[PDB]
Symmetry: C3
Subunit: 325 residues, 3 copies
């Protein structure tokens, strides 16, 4: 639909270039808009630091602060490029700070609340299982680490994913488990780039003399990878690390890059990551099972048209094994 940027209380529309990205791998979506402006156009509202809201046809798709403003000019004209990120960008950028220094008997959601507080970021817990909500006997910050880094460690200790959403909140969840969309070649799926790469896949991963391992049945030949770990590591944290490794490789090994027509799914909602979907390219013998959308890039160009780039990988690659500490 129509792209609108709400900044400095003002409203900006008419962008000739648009690119909005959001992925699981990150705790912050990114956006970038472009357009040529006639001399004498006030751009005071698109200044870095300005609070913004990025809307499309109405529904908000990103809220945070403007990161950058670029003006390229000649005697004749000027091209402006504005870029920003979800409020959660501060968590990725800045140090973890907590009046105390640690927590006692506090859950992940609770520790996140505290870390997020000074950044004015709200935490969104979308889990309803006992394991993930279990409290941490104790949790301590690690010298100057970012909020994001501290939370990766705690979230990893609870086997949950951390992401962000429009509105700019920190969301805790797990890879979608129910398929809700279908990509069909020739219809909503304009182009599909399916890549199966085993260069970094191993038959068995062994961490460190304590030890633990994870195997990968898809790798037909003997291909071991050894990971050196701390001497004092549970047979559990070993098996977990090993497994994390196997899944990370799976994720990067089996991938689909799809070009969708338009920006919305069948149900009208805008494409977003963490959606389980299926692909049908039968014409080329390709019909897939459950693929998780790891990333989405909504673009608008003159030589690209209104398209969405969707990256997908096996759901299993995004399950977070439980690792202590």
């Amino acid at each position: 639909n129509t792209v609108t940027l709400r900044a400095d209380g003002r409203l900006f529309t008419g962008w000739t270039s648009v690119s909005v990205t959001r992925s699981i791998e990150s705790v912050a979506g990114y956006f970038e808009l472009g357009v040529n402006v006639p001399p004498g156009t006030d751009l005071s509202g698109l200044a870095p630091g300005k609070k913004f809201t990025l809307e499309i046809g109405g529904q908000i798709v990103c809220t945070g602060y403007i990161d950058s403003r670029r003006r390229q000019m000649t005697a004749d004209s000027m091209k402006i490029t504005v870029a920003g990120r979800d409020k959660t960008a501060d968590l990725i950028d800045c140090a973890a700070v907590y009046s105390g220094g640690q927590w006692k008997n506090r859950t992940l959601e609770q520790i996140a609340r505290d870390l997020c507080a000074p950044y004015g970021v709200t935490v969104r817990w979308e889990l309803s299982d006992k394991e993930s909500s279990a409290a941490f006997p104790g949790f301590t910050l690690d010298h100057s680490e970012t909020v994001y880094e501290a939370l990766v460690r705690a979230s990893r200790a609870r086997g949950v994913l951390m992401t962000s959403n429009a509105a700019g909140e920190l969301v805790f969840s797990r890879a979608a488990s129910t398929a809700t969309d279908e990509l069909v070649l020739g219809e909503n799926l304009l182009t599909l780039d399916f890549e199966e790469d085993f260069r970094d896949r191993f038959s068995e991963y062994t961490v460190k003399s304590r030890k633990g391992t994870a195997t990968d049945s898809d790798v037909t030949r003997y291909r071991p990878m050894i990971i050196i770990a701390d001497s004092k590591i549970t047979a559990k944290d070993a098996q977990a690390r090993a497994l994390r490794e196997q899944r990370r490789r799976l994720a990067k090994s089996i991938t689909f890059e799809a070009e969708i027509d338009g920006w919305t799914r069948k149900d009208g909602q805008l494409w977003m990551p963490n959606l389980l979907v299926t692909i049908d390219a039968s014409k080329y013998a390709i019909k897939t099972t459950e693929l998780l959308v790891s990333k989405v890039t909504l673009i608008l160009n003159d030589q690209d048209g209104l398209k969405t780039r969707v990256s997908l990988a096996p759901r299993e690659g995004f399950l977070v094994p439980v690792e202590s500490d």
Copy 2:
């Protein structure tokens, strides 16, 4: 004007490709010339290692040694590319060596003299204040560090910049403080690319439990960055490091990339870095204060013409805070 390369005592002119760069960030300017040569052309003088002098319309703009020679040929023709750097390149490349191993009650200028001596590089002290010239009770080299690295540490201990000039001398100074040129869009300024990027800017920088901090008023929201430092660090060396960090980010955050017509300034001199200037792009509401030229690239191409690329950033980004050791 006309580009001439004086090498092996000979004189070479007629280059079809020319690119000469000099920036504050470095202690050595770089150059590269190109041209197609008819079979049977002696290029023995453009051999790597050959001492050279690069002149433009007369005035020398770079002197050092040829670093490389490239010949690309077909049955029909050959394209030659020669590249070199100021004599000071050796200081960036090679180990710091000193018959003794340390100095006692010696100034920065004096320590530089010694380190530069074996490389046949002359030191140019362009400072006349007591602080910068203060002698070092003691100064010691650090296992295999380069001349450049040793001098960065000592120059940092005196809050001064280190650069090179035509003639290839090591120059000590501070960011220019007097504006002497004006870039006007449509006139001498053909194109301007103004970039304001706050992705790496923080509201406060804190180094390390000793501590010290520096804030950045331009960053409206709470965005802290913690820098872990040695336990035994002065409240001074802490505040200094913190401040260095703030300025380095400023430098990379607010930048202008300008395309100037020709190679000379209004007063006839060739463009060079460390010049305080002002920019006027009023047509697009842009009129700036004092910007320091951090880099200059003089180019000559068939599809570029005779132009100069000038990179500018706030002067304050280039002031060197005093840090001990």
Copy 3:
């Protein structure tokens, strides 16, 4: 001639894109084939993990496992790209594993046998001198290092090169010493790119207080490089390391990139690395001595034709100095 890929027992031909690379620097040649396929084409045999044999006009040029399969499709057509490497790729990828953990009085060839065994890779010893075959009083693996890394250390301890060949075997040898081919500009040599770069060349290299050095007569001015090494290092392992450094720089400093017509040498054999050759570009005053082929890339494209890319550097750059441990 004709490019055929034997995979899954099947035979695939008609590739529109072909690129096969092999270089000394590596223990595994790489290949990649491309072609557009009509809907309904079975590609089950080109699946990652599949054992393959890459033949050209008959003679095999690479044998190993398929690493990747890529399918790019639109409603209209699909482009397939398959890539693989010599069997030896596993040695570069995987951990060194040995039922014991060490060897006693075993030669390089023997240690390689053992390390290679679980990967089903056969060792090819092409040396007949006493030094290289001398047994190691003792040799021990180093926590999780790859087979390739363990063997680099042992092969370095014997001054020999390690490479791979078609058939996918691990070969031990030394840089070819007899010239067997001549590249002549205008004839078999279509284009030549000769680069002489001294930016990373030093007059003297000194390792670490034990010490040892190597000089480089080609560097006319004083340019020292110091390499910090372990305190307990022989005056021998010092001189050796220093020399390795000098040769590595030589290799990257004086280089020729040549475009050969076709894929075969004069004697009919396909171009391969580790061939001593001479170049004659007299038309441009260039007639070289003995250059070693460090790499070869056999390509077939629509806008490139049937060509071979040959990279060459001074033979001396590839002699492996003896370093203990």
